C-alpha cells in the first residue's frame, strides 16, 4: 500500500538471492585455487 | 477633504458633529485589530476595545462625500448591505440622495444575459467581510469600492475606508446620517448654518416583528 510497482520480486529478497549466489561463487573459486 | 484650494474652514469638524459621535460610541471597536487598520487606532480602553481617531475618521468621511458628489445621475451609485442592521439605513439614505440601493446574487455584475444585470459606477457597502461577494465581483469590472470598516476588516479591493463601528444598530444608522447630510450640503440643496431638518430616528432600525 505504501509503494509503487516494483517489477520482478520484492527487491530485498532479490538482493538476498544475489548475496547467496556470490557466496557460492566465492566458495567454488576458493576450492579451485 | 477638509483642505480646499481656497483657504476655508467650512468643511471642518465642529463641536456639534463630534458630540454625536461620542453619543452613539461610534469611536469604539472590537478587541481584535487588523494589521491594515493600525493607522486609525489611538489606544486600548477598558475591556480590551480599541479607540478610533476621530480626526482621521472625519477626513475619510468628507473625502467620501466629495467623491460621491460630482457624479451625475445618482443612480450610478449602488449601496449594498448584507447585514440586517442596515437594511433600512440604506433605503432611507437612498430615498434622500437618489442613489441605487440593494440589501447577494453571484453574477449580478458579471452575467450579461441575466435579467437583473446592472453595472453601477461606484459601490458602497456596509461591511467588507459580510459583503465579500459584492466587492469581489466589483474587481472584474473596474468599479471602485467605499466601505465602512472596523478594527478587523480585510481591506482587499477596498479603496476608501471609513474607520467606524458597523456592528451596533445605533452606529450603523448614525453614520449614514453624516454621509447623507454632507453630500446635500456640498450639492447645495441646504445651507450649512441651518440645522439639518432630518432626524436619525428614521435612519434608526427596529425589529420587523
Amino acid at each position: 500500500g505504501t509503494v509503487s510497482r516494483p517489477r520482478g520480486m520484492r527487491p530485498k529478497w532479490h538482493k538476498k538471492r544475489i548475496k547467496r549466489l556470490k557466496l557460492r561463487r566465492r566458495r567454488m573459486r576458493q576450492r579451485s585455487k | 477633504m477638509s483642505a480646499v484650494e481656497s483657504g476655508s474652514k467650512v468643511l471642518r469638524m465642529k463641536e456639534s458633529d463630534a458630540q454625536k459621535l461620542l453619543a452613539m460610541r461610534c469611536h469604539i471597536g472590537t478587541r481584535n485589530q487588523s494589521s491594515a487598520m493600525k493607522k486609525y487606532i489611538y489606544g486600548r480602553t477598558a475591556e480590551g476595545s480599541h479607540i478610533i481617531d476621530v480626526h482621521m475618521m472625519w477626513e475619510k468621511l468628507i473625502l467620501a462625500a466629495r467623491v460621491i458628489a460630482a457624479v451625475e445621475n445618482p443612480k450610478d451609485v449602488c449601496v449594498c448591505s448584507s447585514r440586517l442592521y442596515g437594511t433600512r439605513a440604506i433605503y432611507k439614505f437612498s430615498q434622500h440622495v437618489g442613489t441605487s440601493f440593494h440589501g447577494f446574487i453571484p453574477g449580478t455584475f458579471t452575467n450579461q444575459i441575466q435579467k437583473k444585470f446592472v453595472q453601477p459606477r461606484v459601490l458602497v457597502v456596509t461591511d467588507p467581510r459580510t459583503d465579500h461577494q459584492a466587492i469581489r465581483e466589483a474587481s472584474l469590472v473596474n468599479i471602485p469600492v467605499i466601505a465602512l470598516c472596523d478594527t478587523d476588516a480585510p481591506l482587499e479591493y477596498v479603496d476608501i475606508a471609513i474607520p467606524c463601528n458597523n456592528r451596533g444598530i445605533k452606529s450603523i444608522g448614525m453614520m449614514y446620517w453624516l454621509l447623507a447630510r454632507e453630500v446635500l450640503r456640498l450639492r447645495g440643496t441646504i445651507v450649512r448654518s441651518v440645522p439639518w431638518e432630518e432626524k436619525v430616528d428614521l435612519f434608526f432600525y427596529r425589529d420587523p416583528n
Binding site: - | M1, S2, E5, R66, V67, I143, D159
Partner: protein, 83 residues
Amino acid sequence: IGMFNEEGENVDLYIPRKCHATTTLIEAHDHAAVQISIANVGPNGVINGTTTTLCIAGYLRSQGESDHAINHITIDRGIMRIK
C-alpha cells in the same frame, strides 16, 4: 512623449496611463484598475465644476494597499490635511 520616427511624427499609438502611486504602466487587460474623480469645492462650501482624477493599478488593490496609497496621494496634493 512616445516614439518618434525621426521623420517628425509619432509612431507609438495609445500612450498608456501611469499609476499615481508606483509610476507603472497600466495594461489594457488590467480589469482591476480604477479611476476616481474627487469634486472641488468653492469657498462657501458648495462644489465647483472642476474635479481631481487619479488612477490606481490593479496589483495595488489586490494586495490591499490601495487605501494607504490613496491617503498619501491626497496629502501630497493637499486635498486633505495631515493633522
